[PDB]
């Protein structure tokens, strides 16, 4: 059965503030394929908090969602709170009509999504709120559906659920293309130097917090760009070295300028999860920030590190770029070599973390940079 832990609105408002205004599944509530048929969808036992209301699923099958008539549609399996309903106290013992497990389309879910609307809202308070758990694609009549967990709505970062690391990676090596401007691939694939003449695309360890960011879905941007899912002040840390950096040989060392920048772009709307409307940034918002700017120093390998705080908005693209001159005999930080003999990033890594919010006055005051 779908049970309420503390189902009242005042205590919910207090627990929501204690959860840092984040809602989500605390434990279990995953799909049970062994108990799922063509007319029912089974979900395992678990606990969830939705805008300060504790929801519990009580053993096989733990709970069953009626899927009769559902076919040839992609739907969202949602956990919903409806305060217009009444919890029946039969047996002085509670049915919980204020809690539902249902199927919704994307526009309906967006209109009542906890991330964008609230039961405790000041300007537009709601009586109905929902949390999406899975994308469920119902096939032809008589089949079992396919599904895709909505990881952003599952808490498992726990002590500071709305903040913390958004993305991080292990050290990696990446060949620098012979161009003026290029992105640094932050999404798990680098063009690794492997021999004196060649580099090859190689996976490296990377992790993203789906509540805070996701990989860009576009072919041109998937290796390099993150989509920011939550507004905030973020901290970006980078560290690494430039190996086989170019310079003019003493004939004094002729250094070559380069910079590593972080960048944001909000030109494309609806990149956030569910195609949600982006949050428009304040007038005069930054788009490019120098993290490291200097000249090559005449050494085989030169280290760098930088830490900055930056504002990012729901729907933004975030990326890192390496910039230098294109004349290898005069102004380029890169040389004419390939593989390990060519200029490359070595032991490069980054962490992106959400460290502050942009609510109230901070939007205009802290949000422009």
Instruction: Consult the annotation and say whether 273 binds a ligand.
Output: no
Task: Please report whether residue 36 would count as binding Cs ion according to CB under 5 A.
Answer: no
Task: Please report whether residue 351 would count as binding Cs ion according to CB under 5 A.
Answer: no
Residue 280 or 299: the one with the smaller Cβ distance to its own copies is 299
Binding mask 245-264 for its own copies (x = CB under 8 A): ----xx-xx-x-x-------
With contacts defined by CB under 8 A, name the span among 88-96, 273-281, 316-324, 341-349 that binds its own copies.
Answer: 341-349
Task: Please report whether residue 152 would count as binding its own copies according to CB under 8 A.
Answer: no
Binding mask 167-196 for its own copies (x = CB under 8 A): -xxxx-------------------------
Joined tokens for residue 105: 């389309």
Residue 71: which residues within 8 A CB-CB, separation 6 or more?
138, 139, 140, 141
Task: Please report whether residue 235 would count as binding its own copies according to CB under 8 A.
Answer: yes
Smallest gap, in angstroms, from Cβ of residue 235 to Cs ion? 6
Instruction: Consult the annotation and say whether 316 binds a ligand.
Output: no
State which of residues 2, 15, 42, 268 lies at the interface with its own copies (CB under 8 A): 15
**Strand ordering across the sheet containing 46-50:** 2-4, 53-57, 46-50, 24-28
Q: Angle at Cα 232 formed by Cα 226 and Cα 233, nearest 5°?
A: 100
Task: Please state, as a whole number, how many other Cβ atoms lie within 10 Å of the Cβ of residue 140.
Answer: 8
State which of residues 1, 8, 9, 18 lies at the interface with its own copies (CB under 8 A): 18
Q: Which of its own copies, Cs ion, none does residue 33 bind (CB under 5 to 8 Å by kind)?
A: none
CA distance 328 to 332: 5
Backbone angles phi, psi at 225, to 5 degrees: -110, 140
Task: Provide the Cα torsion 75, 79, 83, 87; round to 10°.
Answer: 120
According to DSSP, residue 264 is labeled: E
Q: Give, as ranges, the residues between 75 and 134 that touch its own copies (CB under 8 A).
A: 122
Residue 71 or 177: the one with the smaller Cβ distance to Cs ion is 71
Backbone angles phi, psi at 361, to 5 degrees: -65, -30
With contacts defined by CB under 8 A, name the span among 31-39, 94-102, 175-183, 343-351 that binds its own copies.
Answer: 343-351
Q: Which of Cs ion, its own copies, none does residue 59 bind (CB under 5 to 8 Å by kind)?
A: none
Cβ atoms 147, 134 nearer than 8 A: yes
Cβ atoms 311, 232 nearer than 8 A: yes
Task: Please report whether residue 35 would count as binding its own copies according to CB under 8 A.
Answer: no
- Torsion-angle region of residue 298: left (phi > 0), alpha (psi -120 to 50) or beta? left
The CA-atom distances, in angstroms, between 228 and each of 65, 71, 308 are 33, 33, 17
Q: Which of its own copies, Cs ion, none does residue 368 bind (CB under 5 to 8 Å by kind)?
A: its own copies
Binding site for Cs ion (CB under 5 A): 18, 38, 71, 214, 217, 227
Q: Which residues are annotated as a binding site?
A: 9, 13, 116, 183, 218, 224-225, 265, 267, 279, 314, 317, 321, 353
């Amino acid at each position: 059965v779908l049970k309420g832990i503390n189902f009242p609105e005042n205590e919910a408002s207090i627990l929501d503030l204690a959860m840092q205004n984040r809602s989500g599944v605390l434990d279990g509530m995953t799909i049970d394929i062994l108990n799922t048929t063509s007319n029912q969808l089974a979900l395992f036992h678990g606990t969830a908090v939705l805008q300060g209301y504790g929801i519990e699923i009580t053993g096989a099958p733990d709970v069953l969602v009626d899927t009769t008539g559902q076919s040839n549609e992609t739907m969202l399996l949602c956990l919903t709170i409806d305060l217009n309903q009444v919890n029946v106290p039969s047996g002085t013992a509670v049915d919980y009509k204020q809690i539902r497990l249902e199927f919704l389309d994307v526009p309906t879910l967006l209109k009542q999504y906890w991330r964008d609307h609230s039961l405790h809202d000041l300007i537009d308070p709601r009586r109905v709120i929902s949390m999406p758990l899975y994308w469920i694609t119902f096939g032809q009549t008589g089949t079992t559906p396919l599904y895709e967990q909505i990881k952003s709505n599952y808490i498992d970062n726990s002590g500071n659920p709305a903040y913390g690391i958004a993305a991080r990676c292990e050290n990696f090596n990446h060949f620098i293309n012979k161009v003026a401007v290029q992105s640094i691939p932050i999404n798990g694939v680098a063009n690794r130097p492997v021999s004196s003449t060649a580099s090859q695309l190689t996976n490296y360890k990377v992790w993203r917090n789906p509540y805070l960011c996701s990989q860009d879905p576009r072919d041109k941007f998937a290796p390099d760009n993150l989509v920011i899912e939550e507004d905030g002040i973020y901290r970006i840390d980078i560290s690494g070295s430039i190996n086989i950096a170019n310079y003019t040989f003493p004939a004094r060392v002729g250094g070559r300028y380069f910079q590593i920048v972080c960048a944001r772009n909000s030109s494309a709307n609806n990149l956030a999860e569910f195609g949600a409307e982006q949050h428009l940034p304040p007038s005069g918002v930054w788009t490019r920030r120098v993290l490291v700017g200097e000249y090559t120093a005449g050494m085989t390998e030169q280290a760098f590190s930088s830490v900055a705080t930056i504002s990012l908005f729901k729907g933004d693209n975030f990326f890192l770029q390496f910039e230098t001159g294109t004349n290898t005999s005069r102004d380029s930080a890169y040389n004419n070599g390939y593989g390990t003999s060519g200029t490359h990033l070595r032991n490069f890594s980054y962490t992106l973390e959400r460290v502050g919010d942009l609510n109230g006055t901070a939007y205009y005051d802290n949000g422009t940079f």
